[PDB]
Design a protein around this ligand. Structure first.
Ligand SMILES: Nc1ncnc2c1ncn2[C@@H]1O[C@H](COP(=O)(O)OP(=O)(O)O)[C@@H](O)[C@H]1O
Ligand SMILES: Nc1ncnc2c1ncn2[C@@H]1O[C@H](COP(=O)(O)OP(=O)(O)O)[C@@H](O)[C@H]1O
Ligand SMILES: [Mg+2]
Ligand SMILES: [Mg+2]
Lengths: 374, 330
């Protein structure tokens, strides 16, 4: 319980894969590390587990330094993608395996195995051998071993990637109810943002080894710190329009839309380090675009793609005011054929603004679900 | 080249993986076979391509019988996860325009077969890649049969979707027909992001094009649902289906269902709420756009929209909904 990373760094030769990670994981917290493949998610969990050495920095688990502690003496349990079960043990044996080495009454053993067995949809396979199960079933068995063991700290490296879409959904639900009941510290890694939003108490976004941002789900969604975070968090990606600053004021920045459309708009974002003439990036999420019974800033274009998902419609629009096609989301079924002329509004209070260095001008509009000043 | 299956069946001893499969795939149609792992998706693809044999029934790649024809002569190209990377230059520079998959396109196969191509790619990459596949099909109208376990890809890519359930065709139709008018509980629970809610109900009346059921609450309120009454007998026990996105806010009321909040998931673009209605087991899942601020344990009320409810018989078959939904012909 309780994990602290103080300037933890990792490097292979002259390549740095983990750069000065600073994290304070509180006891019982559910922390998700997210980012694309190659950003250093597994290397980080492996350093916590003691399966990789820490180049520099200190790692604390339960207040004690663990840099030099052997894997099995750190109080952690780890599960990962396509875990290999012991071929000669029965499902039940593979699930109680961790708890047995750690010593424990058979009473506690069977109690947990049975419980975890139900939760993970495996109570009927208890007596079979792993060779007789599906890839989805073995993975669940692997997850179960650690859940039965109940280590002081759970480390899960993309544990659900081996499951059908439907099973991932149910497993996420089960992982959540398990964390609530056990209250144990859990560090979970995924490349999937939806999963991070759903499971995490707090999320840490990794970008090629660096911590881009750490915060609650909504803190990342409403107030991303840079373009990377803004475009990583949010099912269908945030729209980005290249803009040019034309004026600045107290807690306010004005920009001009690109290409032909040269319309100027005021955005309620901090002017801190913004300078007239700066080429910047304007961000607006598909779900945040308005339907246009006049919003005072309108973009009109030609439908390129239309996705009917039943619960909602995702329209791809080509704006004559030239760029990349403006994705729009609206609830329920929206009737429009791929070719029509669709017009949507652009709400200033919902716009994000990124400098050339990618950093963001702090939005000042107050969003629900995130602690705000005043 | 259109593909067609006539009572196709496959069996490995006493195990039948394909049960009387009847499929009509028109040329230049984007078809997706969806279903859980083990349902027979790969077996079908391989029978069409000839890498496996058809136990009974007939396979037509356009107009012909490929049942007994070597693979290298059916003219069907396949693709899996990742790749083993005057005319040759004109076709390549040509296929390079509409756009690996391209090597297959350049071979100009009669039908394009894809077996879970987005399988092991990052989530965000899967999203980009399918937008890509759709574009590739928009510009190049060849015949494509895509196989996956993920309902999202099916709803997003296919012109026509075929849901497979343990070797049998549960249903065939466009994305919105399957979403709006699922034929059975299996299809109703498979297609759709967070799963459709199912409530055990007991019928207490019928009529022409209309069935009345009572809800499991100590309120046992009775409601009229616009579904065909063909095979409904008063007093019968059935399952009432209602999607999370289709439940009503409150404000509109009209049917209420109130309970205690169990779980709240803030996803930014929407809020998913799990409510425990003091009556039934299994929390009810509710979805509402944007951010909803409710604590766990708080009381929350929602509404049931009659014309949006599905009704299933004890055998899982659905009572064809009659409410007209925009997007589907009939
Ligand atoms: N033993 C190693 N030697 C050199 N580079 C490594 C080693 N292990 C991982 N890496 C580098 O780190 C990245 C992948 O591991 P991480 O553990 O970063 O994976 P991911 O975040 O995709 O799960 C790549 O940039 C890879 O080259
Ligand atoms: N050669 C084979 N012998 C016996 N059973 C097979 C064979 N190939 C596939 N199956 C059966 O078919 C199912 C998996 O293949 P399908 O080809 O059904 O896969 P999926 O739909 O998961 O892609 C399992 O029920 C499996 O036992
Ligand atoms: Mg990894
Ligand atoms: Mg398969």
């Amino acid at each position: 319980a309780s994990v602290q990373l103080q300037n933890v760094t990792k490097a292979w030769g002259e390549v740095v894969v983990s750069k000065d990670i600073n994290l304070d994981i509180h006891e019982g917290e559910f922390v998700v590390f997210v980012g694309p493949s190659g950003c250093g998610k597994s290397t980080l969990l492996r350093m916590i587990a003691g399966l990789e050495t820490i180049t520099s920095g200190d790692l604390f688990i339960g207040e004690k330094r663990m840099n030099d502690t052997p894997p099995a003496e750190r109080g952690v349990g780890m599960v990962f993608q396509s875990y290999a079960l012991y071929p000669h043990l029965s499902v039940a044996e593979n699930m109680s395996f961790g708890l047995k080495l750690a010593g424990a009454k058979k009473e506690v053993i069977n109690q947990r195995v049975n419980q975890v067995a139900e939760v993970l949809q495996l109570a009927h396979l208890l007596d079979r051998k792993p060779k007789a199960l599906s890839g989805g079933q073995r993975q669940r068995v692997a997850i179960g071993r650690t859940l039965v063991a109940e280590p002081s700290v759970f480390l899960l490296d993309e544990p659900l990637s081996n499951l059908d879409a439907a099973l991932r959904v149910q497993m996420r639900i089960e992982i959540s109810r398990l964390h609530k009941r056990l209250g144990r510290t859990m560090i979970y890694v995924t490349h999937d943002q939806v999963e991070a939003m759903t499971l995490a108490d707090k999320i840490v976004v990794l970008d090629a080894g660096r911590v881009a941002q750490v915060g609650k789900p909504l803190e990342l969604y409403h107030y991303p710190a840079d373009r990377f975070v803004a475009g990583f968090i949010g099912s269908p990606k945030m729209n980005f329009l290249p803009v040019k600053v034309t004026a600045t004021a107290i807690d306010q920045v004005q920009v001009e839309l690109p290409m032909p459309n040269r319309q100027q708009v005021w955005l309620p974002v901090e002017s801190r380090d913004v300078q007239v003439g700066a080429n910047m990036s304007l961000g607006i999420r598909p779900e945040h675009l308005l339907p246009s019974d006049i919003a005072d800033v309108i973009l009109e274009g030609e439908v390129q793609v239309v996705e009917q998902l039943g619960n909602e419609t995702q329209i791809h629009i080509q704006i004559p005011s030239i760029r990349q096609n403006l994705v729009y989301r609206q609830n329920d079924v929206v009737l429009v054929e791929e070719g029509a002329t669709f017009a949507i509004g652009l709400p200033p209070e919902r716009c994000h603004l990124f400098r050339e260095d990618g950093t963001a001008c702090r939005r000042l509009h107050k969003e629900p679900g995130v602690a705000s000043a005043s």
